[PDB]
Amino acid sequence: AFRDARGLELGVGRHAMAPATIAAVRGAFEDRSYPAVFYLLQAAIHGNE
Amino acid sequence: HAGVLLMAPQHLDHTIQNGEYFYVLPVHALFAGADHVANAPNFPPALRDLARHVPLVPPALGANYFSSIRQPVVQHARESAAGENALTYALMAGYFKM
Amino acid sequence: WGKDHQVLRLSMENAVGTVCHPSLMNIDAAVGGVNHDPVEAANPYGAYVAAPAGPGADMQQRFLNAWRQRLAHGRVRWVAECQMTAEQFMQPDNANLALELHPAFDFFAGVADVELPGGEVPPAGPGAIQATWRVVNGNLPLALCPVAFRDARGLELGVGRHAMAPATIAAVRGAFEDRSYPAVFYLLQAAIHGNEHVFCALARLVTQCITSYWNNTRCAAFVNDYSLVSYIVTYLGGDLPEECMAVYRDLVAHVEALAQLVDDFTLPGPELGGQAQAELNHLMRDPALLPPLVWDCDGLMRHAALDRHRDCRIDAGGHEPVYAAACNVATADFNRNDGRLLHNTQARAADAADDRPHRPADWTVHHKIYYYVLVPAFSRGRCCTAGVRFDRVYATLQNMVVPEIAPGEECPSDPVTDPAHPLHPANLVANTVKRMFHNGRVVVDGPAMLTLQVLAHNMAERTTALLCSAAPDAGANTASTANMRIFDGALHAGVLLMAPQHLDHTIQNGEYFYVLPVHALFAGADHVANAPNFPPALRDLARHVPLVPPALGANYFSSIRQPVVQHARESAAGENALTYALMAGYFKM
Amino acid sequence: HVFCALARLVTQCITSYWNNTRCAAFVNDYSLVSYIVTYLGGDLPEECM
Amino acid sequence: AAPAGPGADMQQRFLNAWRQRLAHGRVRWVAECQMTAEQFMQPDNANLA
Amino acid sequence: YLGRGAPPLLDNAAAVYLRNAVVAGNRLGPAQPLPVFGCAQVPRRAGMD
Amino acid sequence: APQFHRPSTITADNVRALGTRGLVLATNNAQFIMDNSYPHPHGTQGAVREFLRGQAAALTDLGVTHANNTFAPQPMFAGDAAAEWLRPSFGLKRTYSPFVV
Amino acid sequence: LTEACAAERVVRPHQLSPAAQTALLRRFPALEGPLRHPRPVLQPFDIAAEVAFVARIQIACLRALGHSIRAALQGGPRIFQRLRYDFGPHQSEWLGEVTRRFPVLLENLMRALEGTAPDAFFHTAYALAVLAHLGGQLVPLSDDIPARFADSDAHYAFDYYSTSGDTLRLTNRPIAVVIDEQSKCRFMEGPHRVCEQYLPGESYAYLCLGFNRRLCGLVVFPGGFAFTINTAAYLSLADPVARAVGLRFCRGAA
Amino acid sequence: GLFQEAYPITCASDPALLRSARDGEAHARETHFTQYLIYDASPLKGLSL
Amino acid sequence: MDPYYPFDALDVWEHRRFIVADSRSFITPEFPRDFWMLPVFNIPRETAA
Amino acid sequence: WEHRRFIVADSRSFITPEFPRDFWMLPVFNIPRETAA
């Protein structure tokens, strides 16, 4: 909690994420049915713009 | 160099062979999915539970004590109760040098 | 305060040097000193284990008539669910007060001398007062552990950890408790029977059934199987609105949550007596206990291959197990009595399996999470098992009126308009399965031909009452607890019945499914009290007093006893609570 | 027996009454209400089921 | 360890290699279940020195 | 564990794990444990206040 | 034609030649009186066994009449493919619509 | 004996050829026993020849039991009583059941005597009371016999079977109760078994079954209603058969 | 030994709720939600220590 | 179905120190006789032959 | 003291058994010299 405590000091004043972008990102990580075409495109684009 | 971040360890599926395209290869204790490593096809069944709360990394990539980030920064992330907004800065403050 | 203006602290980690000595398991003089001046016949319903006899199909009508006499005789040892606290502490109203002696044990009036895995009707006469062993902390009676105390512990573990959404459980609880529930959903579950290869065969049926039933009731469809829900997660999670799909993915993530609450409370120590650290800590990690529905054979291959294990006695014919690799039409001998359990569950029936499984180690643990915990969190006492007449089931699974389509005609979509649709009233005759797609409105179309070619592929004979016993583990196994027993009854080819529907002659009362209460967790207040041909005298003893047919384990000789199962059909705290609460009730002793 | 004989008539009577009013039809007899919960659980909107 | 072989098998060669000693004793740095004043007391922190 | 009073575990691998697990560093924890006859010889801390 | 009021008539050849469209009506339109002057050689429990191989092997017949309808059976899981040395064996989730106009 | 039966394909060497018998006898002379004895008490050339040695004794005693039970119970009997147990007034209606309950027991006793394994029969009292009598035609094994069993014929030795429910054995120990018209009971002198605390026939839900060195046994029912049986008129054990029996089951006392 | 008795002393479950012991049992907080106090009842009550 | 008896009854006062030429009694239970069930030995499914 | 009823113990007290006449035509009352067991 102490390591989370001073976060609550610094939590003010700066940008906080929207509530919608919290669960959408987190459910995507915990999507066991995440379609694996997306992994190969990430290796296809491979940093090349 | 040419690596890719796997979010969800999906071993509850034999459609792609489990690690067909992508051998798992953990690079740091930040990145050790407990269902990636333990449910690889060639995994010793004598080392199941000790794999669950220890980030098994072969020492060619770095051990715990000579990494720049040790176990406590890892253990904060998986265990703290706070939502990600507070959790962001709470670990962001975990990178000021000594 | 010390001997100053100084503070001091006494934890319960303070209690390390006293409760942890190997004298907690030292009850030799206890059983001896209570044994003289004996007790009379205490009509031992829950104080006796029966070995199984005959098939499971008639096993009730054995035990219905066998305990027709010494059941209305008196009461069972527990009445304390009605007793408030300190009514146990008072000298009246508790003759069993002088029988509560150890925190880790039980002294109860059981049978005298007959060895337990044997016989049906014990010789009522003189009585004996021995032991069993208290397994987890929840077995303490509810005048000593308050009900509100169980929720007190539960909520405060609830913080910091993943929980179910409050909206989504309303879908599940409506689904679990739906009376007019389409009986294909009981039949199509036994069709897949946990076979992954039959699942990805039949994925369009699995697609539309959940899709159709969501419009009737905002509810999940097939949800009494962890394996089946697990398969819906991976192999189906694309072609749905997220609102439906959120229900299943939240369900697994909460089972993901309730799984890793054990090992946050663990210490790294060596492997020990064959068991691991986690197996000695919590009850869900020990593989000698196995869930009530076991479709594969991963469990006994883990369970019977243990140093704890003594004589998993499957008693219709031969007592000891020998198993099947795959199973088909000529292998599912629909009415047999040998005790062979089927391994016909994996995706690769070509790469078959009798000795080497396919599943992870937490797979059955996940089922032990899903069956022993979550379903009682929605039960409140109302759910019970079923023994399957797969001969009756596989008659009517492959029994559909799906007409030939015309050359140039469209796909069957809707039942009431399209005459070529299988659910159309022109295609509705009784005793076919698209009439059973129609008894509960489930839109399933003309491409259902893809089912039957694989319905003919894999099938399962009939269920069997597997009785595995075991010794106390390494860490409780002293020279006075060596002879102790834990009976753990479960069915192989069985299905859970959530909603007991018997005030309806659509399925006549026990045609496909004879009930067989495998445990006090699944003991039908409306299943069993409304059975095939039936005594009215037990109506008192059915409204309470969970009828466990004693081939499947007793009240005192299991891991989970009566104190927790009333706690399930009690306090109205949230789903998030009781999940953690009953889990906290499962910490070993 | 006569309930499932006329069960389509029971279905249309409820929902047509459900179109006019937000009210249940046959609550005057529990033996009837036992049946609609048991038998007509598919062919109703969930708002009145 | 030195970076040995190709990247495809170095973890899989690792689990065969380090199977013996990694199960032998519990490692030092899994003490995250230890609390404060469980640490500063001489038992249960043999690593207090 | 100061005195002998009880039948130990029959799983002798377990009890010797729990032997020193309890008696790691108790102020009332002996070193060089019990002979056949005699006291446990509770150690002496360097100071008492 | 197998007579459904005597158990001494059900064989696998007599039921597989019967379609499942017609086995709906033949079960509900029989005679209620069970007869017991000709028993079964595999037992009466074996007569139910001989009935259900007659239904299960008839499921190929109801499928072959719909062979202009569905698609090729895709390999549902991994491990079912010939060439394995450069690309894996896919597993196709058969959640599609098997229908050919 | 293998290759003379393997090259000749003689599956059992009593089907061995007469020249093929004696030519082996010209080679190895200790085989005159298992080939040329009329009725050897051990069976020649079988695996369970020691086991079939035991199962006969299990059989031959049961007929010595079963034709002796019929002997004292030929017709309608007069058993009146043999022990002293007084009644309360409503306690006689319990024996009103024992009238009705009675004849199903004597089948199921003998069914259970069949129902035991013979390996589990030799730990019971009747299998050692005969050995106390076959040693009298020597101390039998395990020394379960007390020092004073060999004194009188009044020292009997009981087993205990469950009357109601299932008809099952309720002992480990032969419980030797000294018995004195009437005669009251008395124990002998002396890890905890339930039923071993009572007198024979003292209470309900107990069948009591004692035997002697004289091998005149008792069947004691609750209420004094008991009777002797002359099983000594039905034990037909041939001494050369029984002399391989006793030596495997006796112990030479120092 | 003669009375077969044992006296409780000033004790509670929170150092928070131990604060109201230094004013006597007049307004001593007996009970918050679970946090319980038992005031000193002894011959040693009210004394120097 | 009543067993035969020669005599009808007596009533004896028995002093506890004055027991001479001792005798014993018979024990019958407390539950009603519908519970002391029939002697049952069923034939098993498999037989010796 | 102690208070209970009392009947004098004599050897003229008989409990009556009946027989179904087939009781000795049982498989165990009539055993041959060798069994199938």
From TrEMBL, chain G:
Domain of life of the organism encoding this protein: Viruses
Coiled coil: none
The UniProt record lists the keyword Magnesium: no
GO cellular component, one term: host cell nucleus
One Pfam family cited in the UniProt record for this chain: Herpes_UL35
Keyword Manganese: no
InterPro entries: Herpes_UL35 (IPR007584)
Keywords: Capsid protein, Host nucleus, Virion
Gene Ontology biological process: viral process
Intracellular or extracellular location(s): Virion; Host nucleus
Family per record: Belongs to the herpesviridae small capsomere-interacting protein family.
Record note on quaternary structure: Interacts with the major capsid protein/MCP.
Job of this protein: Participates in the assembly of the infectious particles by decorating the outer surface of the capsid shell and thus forming a layer between the capsid and the tegument. Complexes composed of the major capsid protein and small capsomere-interacting protein/SCP assemble together in the host cytoplasm and are translocated to the nucleus, where they accumulate and participate in capsid assembly.
Official protein name in the record: Small capsomere-interacting protein
